[PDB]
Amino acid sequence: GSSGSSGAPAEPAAPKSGEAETPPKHPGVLKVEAILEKVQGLEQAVDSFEGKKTDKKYLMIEEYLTKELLALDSVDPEGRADVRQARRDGVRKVQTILEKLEQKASGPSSG
Numbered sequence: 001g002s003s004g005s006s007g008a009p010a011e012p013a014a015p016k017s018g019e020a021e022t023p024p025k026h027p028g029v030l031k032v033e034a035i036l037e038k039v040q041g042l043e044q045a046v047d048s049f050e051g052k053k054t055d056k057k058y059l060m061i062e063e064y065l066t067k068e069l070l071a072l073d074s075v076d077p078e079g080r081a082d083v084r085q086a087r088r089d090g091v092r093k094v095q096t097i098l099e100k101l102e103q104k105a106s107g108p109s110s111g
Contacts, residue, residue: 003110004100028075028083032090035071039090042068043097052105065098 011033015024042064051057072090077083103109 001099001103001109004096005110026080026082028077028080029086031075032072032083032086035068036086036090036093039065039068039094039097042094046097046101046104049101049104053102055105058101058105061101062098065094065101069094 013025042061045061049061069091072087072094075083075087077087
């Protein structure tokens with residue numbers, strides 16, 4: 001691999017039933033955003049993880065990561081980009097974390 005670090009934490013949230021004005025957020029998305037929100041936590045561990053691919057600690061994060069994936073897939077977009085994009089994003093995100101974890105365990109590399 002060659003480097004890997006990027007993001008953009010900037011997403012509003014104000015769900016309510018107030019006619020007129022900007023529309024509410026999509027549930028199909030929030031569903032993912034809800035999971036992702038957690039992922040971030042599993043990520044912080046990775047970025048600050050240490051061990052191997054065998055170590056239990058890793059198994060915890062490893063499983064935890066996937067746990068979210070399934071939750072990301074469990075989401076049925078049916079045919080909504082706003083959702084799909086989020087899904088493919090959330091999934092792609094966690095994935096990157098997994099690919100990083102295994103690496104973090106096999107030894108970090110940044111500096």
